Symmetry: D2
Subunit: 115 residues, 4 copies
């Protein structure tokens, strides 16, 4: 699993469950092409987005649908979504975890890149 | 001043100075139209992006060019930029402060919205 | 003003108003001695805690009473308080802004240190 | 495992390895009594701090030695340590994960409390 996403909720103190997300890869014409998508599990995780063969170097965007998550909880949010845009770089063996911590008017995101 | 941006550096413990950013507004055709741009001052603030008249209801995107900021400090960071996407002025005019706190592999953002 | 505190609320998207906090300074006997206290204003800021003369070198602790803040908003939060412990003025006088961003189960803090 | 700690590094984009931490429980005389301690693993985790029988309701403090972590990396940090102070409450079956994301001048912490 070269790419996985972990989403946490700072209001409930829990994983953020059933959060939809879309992953895009930047194409040659500078447009965002759909690459992978899914919904977070009961543990706030989304595994199986891609494979080592498919996940080549390039610029990727992970769009997390935070607005729909907060609306389903009956809480007024600020953001339309949270976006994480990064370049995947082959240095040596790398596994990427994108983590996000959500609040109605704020979000934080970090990357955990390991061998 | 209805839209202000404050950027802080979590490595140095300082305002993030000379950070470029571009603001876009979603048009009727679902494309991102350029709206305003500028760079942060010595206090890490960017003022005067727009006016109460021009800042109508809409979906806005603030793209903070964090990769250029870190590269100039000798750090190869994870993200291409930090993006803040939100609906503005849909319940009438509000004043928005978008704040961002930057690290090489992480960022946080929050909004302060006043009437 | 050599020591200022700014507190924001990530649920409401507003300054965190009327937040109490207590500042302590470590004494020679390794105990926390009371140093200053106050509460945040309508802008979420607390100014005038100390003076350049009184704010000598030392280890300081800023204890922000976040549990009382959330309880008054109808939220039973996770933390008792948010604590910020740091050495100040060990390379000469500096001006410190301690910022905190609050959610019911999370908090973030940063410092802006200027000469 | 009723209590575990996850520490991440926002400068390196990695787990924070070999971070020492101390857990204390508030005693009747309002003093902090040592309860458990250890150092984070290669995954930034610290497991086996306590057991379900020992981890009773009370006020706990997790002190993360961030200063020594940054000094070992040759980076000047702001904080002496990061403190997380909370009440453990029996509602139903609960497992607590305290997570922290570290930068030299900032830290963020959240709680993930699950069944
Ligand atoms: O000193 C001021 O005036 C000032 C203004 C805006 C501010 N936003 C923060 C802040 C933002 C994020 Cl996203 C996370 C954290 Cl920990 C802190 O600190 C501020 C300080
Ligand atoms: O319990 C786990 O396994 C687990 C994994 C990844 C995690 N990422 C965080 C985290 C992320 C941000 Cl952006 C801000 C903060 Cl305060 C915390 O906490 C985690 C916990």
């Amino acid at each position: 699993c070269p790419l996985m996403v972990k989403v946490l909720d700072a209001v409930r103190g829990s994983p953020a469950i059933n959060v939809a997300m879309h992953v895009f890869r930047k194409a040659a014409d500078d447009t965002w092409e759909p690459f992978a998508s899914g919904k977070t599990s009961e543990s706030g995780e989304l595994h199986g987005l891609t494979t080592e063969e498919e996940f080549v170097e390039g610029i990727y965007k992970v769009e997390i649908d935070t607005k729909s998550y907060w609306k389903a909880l009956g809480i007024s949010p600020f953001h339309e979504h949270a976006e994480v845009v990064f370049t995947a770089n082959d240095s040596g063996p790398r596994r990427y975890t994108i983590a996000a911590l959500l609040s109605p008017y704020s979000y934080s995101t970090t990357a955990v890149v390991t061998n």
